């Protein structure tokens, strides 16, 4: 992101925690601006000897090296819970062919058969039909109803 986060004279908005008393734990966000106690003497909110600010600016300039030019980093973490999983893939579909023995796969129900233009009258919320013996015989096409 050099052209964006690097400007003439340098960009110093982005910082980094320079001192910390412990290594961070997974996904741990620490924004504390406590003046770091580098020594044994407490700082009491006064900068000085062994009392240094935790955050330091970044060197982002157009003429900087690649190792120091700005980079925009996005980390995506996938979480599974004891809940409905609401983020999915696109799941593109294929064409619809009738009057031919095809191995279909509609919304969730799969099978093999010939798909023909039926004259059954589903209700608007109903998705597929069942026979007297719990066998699916009619399916509403998800793309065109």
């Amino acid at each position, epitope marked *: 992101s050099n052209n964006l986060d690097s400007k003439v004279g340098g960009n*110093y908005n982005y910082l980094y925690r320079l001192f910390r008393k412990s290594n961070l734990k997974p996904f741990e966000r620490d924004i504390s*601006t406590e003046i770091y106690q580098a020594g044994s003497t407490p700082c009491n909110g006064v900068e000085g000897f062994n009392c240094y*600010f935790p*955050l330091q600016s970044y060197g982002f300039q157009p003429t900087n090296g690649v190792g120091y030019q700005p980079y925009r980093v996005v980390v995506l973490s996938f979480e599974l819970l004891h809940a409905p999983a609401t983020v999915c893939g696109p799941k593109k579909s294929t064409n619809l062919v009738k009057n031919k023995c095809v191995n279909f796969n509609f919304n969730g129900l799969t099978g093999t058969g010939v798909l023909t233009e039926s004259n059954k009258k589903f209700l608007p919320f109903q998705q597929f039909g069942r026979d007297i013996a719990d066998t699916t015989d009619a399916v509403r096409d998800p793309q065109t109803l």
Partner: nanobody
Amino acid sequence: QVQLVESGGGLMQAGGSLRLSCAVSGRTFSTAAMGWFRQAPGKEREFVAAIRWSGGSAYYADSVKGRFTISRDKAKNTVYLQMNSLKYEDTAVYYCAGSKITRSLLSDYATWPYDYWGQGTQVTVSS
């Protein structure tokens, strides 16, 4: 956009006190730090005092420690320069300055560049 409006100061006797202000409008310097500069005739402009805008921790030059006091008010967006214990050598035009850069070392603000500056206020010491 950004303007630094100084007020107060002028002529004061030896041993007297002055207090300077610098109102910033159109910009806030939360993580950055503001500083003061003075230029005696025939000499280069030098660092006076800086204060961290968010934290209030103040850093001073060697020749100004113990006589000058800097403070800032976030609400009023104006920095103060309490200037006690005058010396004749302080005679110079004081400039309130602003920089866009955030620095861990509060001493770095005496050397690091400033992108915003005031109009300059004359300070004269009389005996």
